[PDB]
């Protein structure tokens, strides 16, 4: 959309935030997201964060969302928005970037940041940083008590 | 996109990793999926940390790239490790393995060949201070030649096209 908000924006955000509760609820990094088709506010895929229930090493809560909407066209991408509860990493970035995934609205970038947010933009990707209190309140929290897990989930 | 960069010189264990993920290639190839694979390998003894293979028509997977799933089969790590290894791939890494060797922050990539496919990724790893070495191996380049000859349409699917 470009400036404006998209009518699916809130929707978008509020599904993040659900995931990234229940992954919280899990034991797991509170990180969520969803895919919508912005056409028609279809929600293609939604999850979090992976990491603890599956012991895995790339399930963050971007690649989670995109695995859970199955294979598709390389098309239909091309006209969705990505919700994530957190600014994506170097690697939840590339994704974006390969499926060409045009905007990506995110929750917060306080508690985390990478170089990824910018490179978005470089690659003509639209970023939109809704600064919501909600996720970063939950994200802060479990980088209080759990310092290391969450380190680990960005490899430091 | 520099015009004064480097690339590398040779490890040891490298003749190693780019066998294994030509077997993992192989053994993609075989499963009817995209044959790229790849592995990991602690620089520091040699020691495999894993290995596999794309897994887009295996598992139905959006995500399971070659690198993707070797890094996935390595299993959770402490994140000092991965900062002294190497990833070796069958193919040039696109935007999304390209960010995943950037976020772990592993040191080096060996690419297999760049003919077949090469994404801005492979220059985008060097800007951000990854060492890039590609072998040019013919058994990868004949092998993905081959997989885009016969399936044009799932080799685009798997590269959101
Ligand atoms: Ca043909
Ligand atoms: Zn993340
Ligand atoms: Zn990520
Ligand atoms: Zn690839
Ligand atoms: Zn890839």
Known sequence: TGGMASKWDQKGMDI???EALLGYKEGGVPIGGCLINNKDGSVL?????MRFQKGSAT????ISTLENCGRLE???YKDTTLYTTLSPCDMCTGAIIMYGIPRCVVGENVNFKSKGE???QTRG????????ERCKKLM???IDERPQDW??????
């Open 118 to 120: 910018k490179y978005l």
């Open 16 to 18: 993040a935030y659900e």
């Open 45 to 49: 895929g939604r999850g979090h964060n």
């Open 74 to 76: 390389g098309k239909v």
């Open 125 to 132: 990707h639209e970023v939109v940083v809704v600064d919501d």
């Open 140 to 142: 802060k929290q479990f």
């Open 151 to 156: 380190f680990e989930d960005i490899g430091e």
């Open 59 to 62: 399930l963050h809560g971007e």
